[model samples]
Target: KIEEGKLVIWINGDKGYNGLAEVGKKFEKDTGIKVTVEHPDKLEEKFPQVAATGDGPDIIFWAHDRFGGYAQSGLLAEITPDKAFQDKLYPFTWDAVRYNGKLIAYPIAVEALSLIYNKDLLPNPPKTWEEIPALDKELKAKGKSALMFNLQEPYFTWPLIAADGGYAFKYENGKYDIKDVGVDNAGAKAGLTFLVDLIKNKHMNADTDYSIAEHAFNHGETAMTINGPWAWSNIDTSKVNYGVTVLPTFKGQPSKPFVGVLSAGINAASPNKELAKEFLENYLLTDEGLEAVNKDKPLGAVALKSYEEELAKDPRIAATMENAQKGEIMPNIPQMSAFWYAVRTAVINAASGRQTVDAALAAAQTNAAA
Candidate 1:
């Protein structure tokens, strides 16, 4: 039955559909407060218009970095000097969650890019882009694809650019300095040059759909793939032995995977502020809360104090956590949406020889900043 004045919680459709029953059970057991968890798939699509009219979900699970622009625009509320609670978080996890000067989101879970390669085929994965082509050659000579990349997705490419010292924006002193936008940096050019060479040299098949790449890896047709944690369970690990490692360092920097921190935030307009605050304290802030998350999700904890113990117990998960340590939050600037599409188009055009790398990048810069 619906209860009036109850706490209304909305999670992504997937989360609510597949994961919320347990959370709902736990919330009800912990507090007498009735918690209604709703999964409306188009929440994000409709949120801006709704929030603009002062009607939005009281709490939502979203990435801190992606949520930054909203917080900056006053569409979200700030929970600052978050020091009291921040002290409990993973080191630097809150960096992207801050806007102007205030911390806007409470982080809960994090995921990032990492190297997952067939250990049986290549006992040692290449640590740099320079080594990949040679490794690909050796593997292909044995009747297997040396490697494959998803040309269709931007998330997979950003790490390689970062591995070579490229960044979309260089953040410093609480501001994003565009001068350091590194997509077109010398290092990025060198990295992309390697990719172009790899394809031209027949080192890897041109970008395949994600499912095809996974199937290739599973069947041992491909030796390695760069992907995020979400793919961990889908690969057929039995056919080909595999292992995980940090994204290879390019030039001098390790591939800077986009670290996305999923967090829960309170709505300033919520009627159950005191109860919500209590839930944040008793369930979200406590060690028990942290354990529940790490246990249920099996990903690294967002709280720094929680990682040490968890890592000590499971080294694989520890390695994943270590990979995350090298990541920078995906930027959350309002311009980010524009920046992403522009950069994708630019990279694709450059890779296809439609234009010089410089021309593609320049077009992207202008479009993104506009």
Candidate 2:
């Protein structure tokens, strides 16, 4: 089942995965095997559809969030990575690819949200939510908004939603309690009400989104934005002097963002499963492997222990990891598709003055559960 000398992989972004594609060349050269690294659109939706017919790439690279449904659908093979090599990765990275008791993938990169501020606008960013209003007074006189983030984005606003101990699903004992939807609970109400009041008081824009928030922060209209490492490219390119830090506190409670792992896995029906594993372990996941990857595309909060000293030199990586260490794994279950829709609707309705916090959340719980 070696499939002669060919192995293929499907990755999404061109520049993002181009470094790995370079490593694939070395994999091809050294092993006398051809490694085809493809960047395809709609791989998330299409992979399952194609794999069901026993026709797809040998491997797929995507977020850990998709693996639960993939495993449940029998699209992924049980992966047993080299144990010593697996031991070298951060425990959370290993934990990310595991479902129930099966390892379905290999984690390569880590990501999470943090507070990024303009050093020129705010030499020292506020350490707590209550302190932002006073800073707003000083910043307003200077014609700068105190802070702006994606107001309608559930992913960015989750920390605020969970600040008072709320969650989309109850994750405990190594699995999600899918039936336990917490978006309408007392703790959830407290967090949602906080954001809604901020909008009502004009401390935040009711119409802001990812691009608007990022644009405002990069242009110096807003002092800070709650975002992930992906924001680095535009902000850096825009030439803004910025500093990233862990999110500030609210009611003496620290907020937690969701952690994401960009990972790779083999298709169960691939005849070259063993060759796929060999390429992953021997060529793609090595020190030289990641060195080439980082050379072409710098990573933040890298999962491998070997690059710790070199990558932590960058302050951005340090702060991102600080926040991620305190964060929760995004729920990977299929029911989570409903969770995103419900949270967005609830926040939109409340922010637009169309529904009260209680009513909106009640409908959110009902909508997500229904």
Candidate 3:
């Protein structure tokens, strides 16, 4: 049996950890258990190795994307919250943390991409992607671009493909069918074509990376951009009068971005399994704990319904939640590792006009299969 006096947790150095530390103090005080939280560099790479030796943390705090792989390796314990606790969180959040139909973590927060616009540049955000060309023309007259983003990156571009009916895999029956790849479909080609048109017409350039795009928005050189709530910290609120809304439609279809959830999972090899469970359930999931977790950095909408209700009063959180409701949960399968690089290659090639849309997408499909 493990020692009853202490609990150790491994977390990343992001905003999530800052929140967790705040709540962990209360957990320690209430339960009389000494809690130690470590923000390790490259926690994902270091965790499995350390846990395999039976000498790592009792709990791991991180994004849900890696949960499937950890659970498959028998490194994570199954978390079965009672129906009352389960019913309190968004259904999609629970879905995000599950691996092979078993819950592997406690979902903490949810995030999705949305249209973040400068009110001074465009008082009303465009409702459809088709309206962007006219807006771009007008903005160019004032030495600005209507829309700007990292054209070489796939994460920001996936929403456009999804709005046109494209997807990485055919998700069904509560799991992703990796055998069914949709990167080269007609919808994907249409979406890539639109992106290429933007570069061809000089509305956005292939050279515009993340830093450049963010700088452009901060300096009012771009009227709008599509990004997540994490960007809120970098944005200069005084220089830009901004508003957040759902991404514009494509041919009447909503632009659905991938929803990512931050979560905490128990280590299957930990000797303190029961105590870890009690700590997670009794303290971490309570209203007071959640409030403390969100107090330092409110990056996204939390999973609890009551916390979401409290956040809904803030327009930024309300807008992000609206988009998240229409978004698809990011697949937590190991196969997603192959998908990211392939899609990035396709986006860069297509945006730079080095390869035709069909050729670029075909290359992506082939790479993903490899």
Q: Tens digits of per-residue lDDT for model 1 on 239-320?
A: 5688877778777677777777766666655666566656655565556555554443444434456554554555455556
Q: What lDDT score is found at residue 164 in candidate 1?
A: 62
lDDT of 2 by residue, 128-201 (tens): 87787777778889888888998876878878778778788887796788888989988789878888888888
* Model 1 worst lDDT window (10 residues): 13-22
TM-score-wise, the better of 1 and 3 is 3
List clashing residue pairs in candidate 3. none
* lDDT leaderboard ranking: 2, 3, 1
Error of 3 at 271 (Å): 5.0
Q: For each candidate in the order shown, give its overall lDDT on alpha carbons.
A: 0.66, 0.81, 0.81
Q: Better model by TM-score, 2 or 3?
A: 2
Error of 2 at 61 (Å): 3.0
